[PDB]
Amino acid sequence: GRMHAPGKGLSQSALPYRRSVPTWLKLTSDDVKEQIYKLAKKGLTPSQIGVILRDSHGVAQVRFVTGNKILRILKSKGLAPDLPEDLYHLIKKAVAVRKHLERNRKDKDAKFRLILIESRIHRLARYYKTKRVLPPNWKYESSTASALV
Amino acid sequence: GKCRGLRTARKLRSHRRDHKWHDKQYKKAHLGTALKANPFGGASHAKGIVLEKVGVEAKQPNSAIRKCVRVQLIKNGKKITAFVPNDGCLNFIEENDEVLVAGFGRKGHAVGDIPGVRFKVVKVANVSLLALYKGKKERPR
Amino acid sequence: VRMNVLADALKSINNAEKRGKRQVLIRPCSKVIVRFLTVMMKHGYIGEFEIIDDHRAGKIVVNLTGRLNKCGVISPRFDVQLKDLEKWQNNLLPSRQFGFIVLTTSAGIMDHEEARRKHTGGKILGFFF
RNA sequence: GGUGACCACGGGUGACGGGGAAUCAGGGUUCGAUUCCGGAGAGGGAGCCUGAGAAACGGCUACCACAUCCAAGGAAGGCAGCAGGCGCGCAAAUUACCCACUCCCGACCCGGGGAGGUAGUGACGAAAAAUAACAAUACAGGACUCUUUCGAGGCCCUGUAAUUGGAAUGAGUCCACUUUAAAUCCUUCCGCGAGGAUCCAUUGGAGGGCAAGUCUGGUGCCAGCAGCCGCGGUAAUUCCAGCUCCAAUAGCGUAUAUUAAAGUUGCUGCAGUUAAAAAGCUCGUAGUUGGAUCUUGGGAGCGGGCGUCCCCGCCGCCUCUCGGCGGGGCCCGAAGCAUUUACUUUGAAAAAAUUAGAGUGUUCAAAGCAGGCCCGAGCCGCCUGGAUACCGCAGCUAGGAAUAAUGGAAUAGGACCGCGGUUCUAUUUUGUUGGUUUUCGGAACUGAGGCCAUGAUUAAGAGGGACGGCCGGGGGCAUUCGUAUUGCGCCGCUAGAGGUGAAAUUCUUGGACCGGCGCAAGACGGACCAGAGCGAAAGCAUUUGCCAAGAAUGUUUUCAUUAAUCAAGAACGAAAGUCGGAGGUUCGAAGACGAUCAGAUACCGUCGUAGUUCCGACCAUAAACGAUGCCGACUGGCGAUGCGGCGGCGUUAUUCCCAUGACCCGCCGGGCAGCUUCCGGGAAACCAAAGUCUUUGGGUUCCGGGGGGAGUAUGGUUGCAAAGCUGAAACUUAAAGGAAUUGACG
RNA sequence: AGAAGACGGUCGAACUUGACUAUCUAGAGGAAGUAAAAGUCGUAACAAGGUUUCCGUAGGUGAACCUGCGGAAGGAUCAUUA
Ligand SMILES: [Mg+2]
Ligand SMILES: [Mg+2]
Ligand SMILES: [Mg+2]
Ligand SMILES: [Mg+2]
Ligand SMILES: [Mg+2]
Ligand SMILES: [Mg+2]
Ligand SMILES: [Mg+2]
Ligand SMILES: [Mg+2]
Ligand SMILES: [Mg+2]
Ligand SMILES: [Mg+2]
Ligand SMILES: [Mg+2]
Ligand SMILES: [Mg+2]
Ligand SMILES: [Mg+2]
Ligand SMILES: [Mg+2]
Ligand SMILES: [Mg+2]
Ligand SMILES: [Mg+2]
Ligand SMILES: [Mg+2]
Ligand SMILES: [Mg+2]
Ligand SMILES: [Mg+2]
Ligand SMILES: [Mg+2]
Ligand SMILES: [Mg+2]
Ligand SMILES: [Mg+2]
Ligand SMILES: [Mg+2]
Ligand SMILES: [Mg+2]
Ligand SMILES: [Mg+2]
Ligand SMILES: [Mg+2]
Predict the structure, then answer these.
(1) Domain limits at A137?
(2) Residue C20 at interface with chain B, using a CB cutoff of 8 Å
């Protein structure tokens, strides 16, 4: 029921049986990989691309259209970010909590939401150390964090 | 609930270990105290010298005087009251006479009335009250 | 969380047959589920179950009959060494006259009778009777 | 440098280690100084000779620790060999006889052996097993038969007696023999050896638990009884006695250690609303625990019940680069090796005794391991044993691959004489030995090609992460307002008012109280306000701004096992409390008076300090309470509501519609809640959950084991201190307690 | 060959003084508990226990105790009638 909160909710995405492309679609495995390509270039996260591609554009799921999933398309060409998008969203968040804690030293609430956030960082980190996308050294540091965003 | 897992043989052993210093019947037996405290140094009976005869007043609901002996044990020099069982037997025992005192059956509890008397006399000058109060063996002289 | 997908399922197919429910679905599904349910099919303990193939995990839908008093699951799969098999089937089944400890040996998943014919031990899963 | 909470290191032991023991439905629990194995020490240590072999104690050297004789110069001491004594002690044998058995040392058939055997002592303990039987009477009865019954025939019986009666035997004693070494003991037997008054069964009980007398004497809350429940105060089923009976009974009692009993230590397998009990809350390292997902259907046959349905050997792969059972095969020899285990099954190895248990007239049995036989002994000798199973874990071997981990290709690599460049270096070969250079064989390195359907399982009604529109007394920081409140300023009028089961201290014509208008300071945010809202729990409400943060829903957004709970370790934690500081609106411990009361150092009054108010540090606890751990699964209804979404049928409005927005009617997710019920629970109260529990185990955290003593003492630690945290025992104690019932008194 | 002897060194009992820890105890006088169970002074609690009760904290008091503040209902109200 979530990692760090009471709320035991469920709201998630859900795909069909069918996987084969849905025939509206023109494009083809190339023209999608041409487009993911240009969006990442412009500066968007692997999530954020998947977004643009569905609402405005056409692709239910990149994964089905092309062979592989978005990250692999960026990574095998070298547009992938330094660290995982998923993580620096937490780091960027932490640094934001840090900031106003450093002006407002009363906020007891912010002093989970930091501690929790710190803990959801470390936790993440130490698979990225076993799945080896991060080198076995990198570590948080409060000071060096603000830079890392 | 319980830990239930499969490489949990210790969390279990070590659980069922300490949750015996909350048993009462083992903390007598395995701690130390008992051997240290009971004048009967872990020993079934013990010999001691009758230093005086003392009547004890029984616990309220039953009025009566119980007829016991202050003993001093040889091995310790630890003192004692021992209720001399069966009628008119205090009459036998004189001062300074060597008695073999055994327990009461409650092992530490005082028995029934006789408030705070764990021990009962058996022998007297190598005789045995059972023989005297039956009139089989007489008093030695 | 979902640790053991039997206990999950078997609770919900004991726990229907009490209510007299005609049939039930079991949410997570597995190979081990199928393979241990097909054992229950032979001695009659259930009827024909029809596994849905949601693309991910699986669902099953079990035709029940009246016949299952209880099925349960021994949760850690202790390793049963054939000499113990008796001592278990003493204290885990209502009689020596029926009752089936499903377990999982060298030669597949099967009841205790079939591990005894082949003379193998292995890991206890559960029991229905 | 090495070890450590997978708990070291430190301390303790009523600890020489195993082999086993008694207990025991299965699982354990304690004991194993105990004859078998293994270790150690000869008062204690150290060092020593000597010795293959010893740091040897029936050697010695001191010392220490012990102790003997003395001619006072000196000398000799080691039972934890056997006997014995002393002391200790609840608690344990004879200065016995002997090498005859089994064995050992010697130069050895020949001596010696307190190793050892044999006696004695010996309710440590185990086996067997007398303490009478039987006929006829006398009777005392009761199933056939006979009798309406009373009676009788009697095959049946059984009670007591007469013992009426002889028969039978042993306990003893003791001729004799065996035994043995000589005995003894046992086995053999001559001879004597049973009418109870003997050849004499006792220990506890006789209310219940618990089998057995409101039989009879005596005492009279004494004596006394009673493991617990209890009895005893003038008829005691309870004390002391008498008679009768019961249990076991040659044994039987109490002393306590310990096991079942204990579903009261709970792995199997306890408990946590109230009974003893879930941390205040949360984070979190070790530990434990962790979704799904990967060779199959099928084939070929033999065998049970034209085909169908049970039942078996087969389709571990690779190698052949390796053996060989001038070119060979054939396949075993080697290894890729079982990815790397976990798991399972088969071997082998497991000292005997013990154990389980084959075999066996020990007269049976504990035992013993022999015995059996063949034999009239002429056989001058045959025949068989001394079975077997278990023997944890680890270790070794071999099958299997059910499940659990674990592994392999992704900034490219396996193979494919695929090809070469560079280098290396082995060795066959040039009738031999050297030199040079080759060919080739094997490494190492590395240019450049071919092929490889060439590599990513999926996304969890798991999680993590993005975005969307709301949401909310969530948190901070600013800002704004409201009243009342007391304070004061002024003005008006006037004498009482506050307080009260009644009154006074009190406030007051020095004009209080009241009325009006003004300012003041600080408080707190009324109604709206709810089984309404949010947060973690403390939690959280005047307007507006800003600052982060969050649930939920929505989502053919991305990541892809990342997760749950968690010793250890952290964050926060009313009030009260404490140091600093700011402030003093009321209320108000403390404190002062008035009453009330037998008194009130209490309540009820009138004052009022700390504090309640702020900002800064600490403290770290509640009935911190839903007296309900957290995650996860499943099982019924029915109503409501907060949020989000979705759909529809409404309309008020709102405009020409719209968009809305406001109502209505549905559905959906997740929230706070309600009722109802023979799910099912539940000692009960009760509980959609406290349900899924003898039909016992989804994961995991904490924690209780009669009540007090006691949350005490002591120790440690934190704190400025209150105190916080950790946290015993002796002793005492039989219930304390919980749920419901009648009572009965408020 | 070779004794008595002597210089050195090594294991080292032993002895002397410190340290630690273990265990065990002597103690003027002080304060609890329990016994236990029938003394005095009250009467705190259970009935609306005469003042709903209880927790924590604080302060007080001859004694139960009392009073603040914040709690609790384990209440003496599952409601207060838009
Ligand atoms: Mg967590
Ligand atoms: Mg000792
Ligand atoms: Mg000695
Ligand atoms: Mg020695
Ligand atoms: Mg020596
Ligand atoms: Mg000696
Ligand atoms: Mg003895
Ligand atoms: Mg001997
Ligand atoms: Mg015996
Ligand atoms: Mg006799
Ligand atoms: Mg009785
Ligand atoms: Mg026991
Ligand atoms: Mg049992
Ligand atoms: Mg219990
Ligand atoms: Mg709680
Ligand atoms: Mg308001
Ligand atoms: Mg902790
Ligand atoms: Mg506070
Ligand atoms: Mg304060
Ligand atoms: Mg201050
Ligand atoms: Mg007052
Ligand atoms: Mg507490
Ligand atoms: Mg419960
Ligand atoms: Mg259970
Ligand atoms: Mg207790
Ligand atoms: Mg209570």
Answers:
(1) 81-149
(2) no
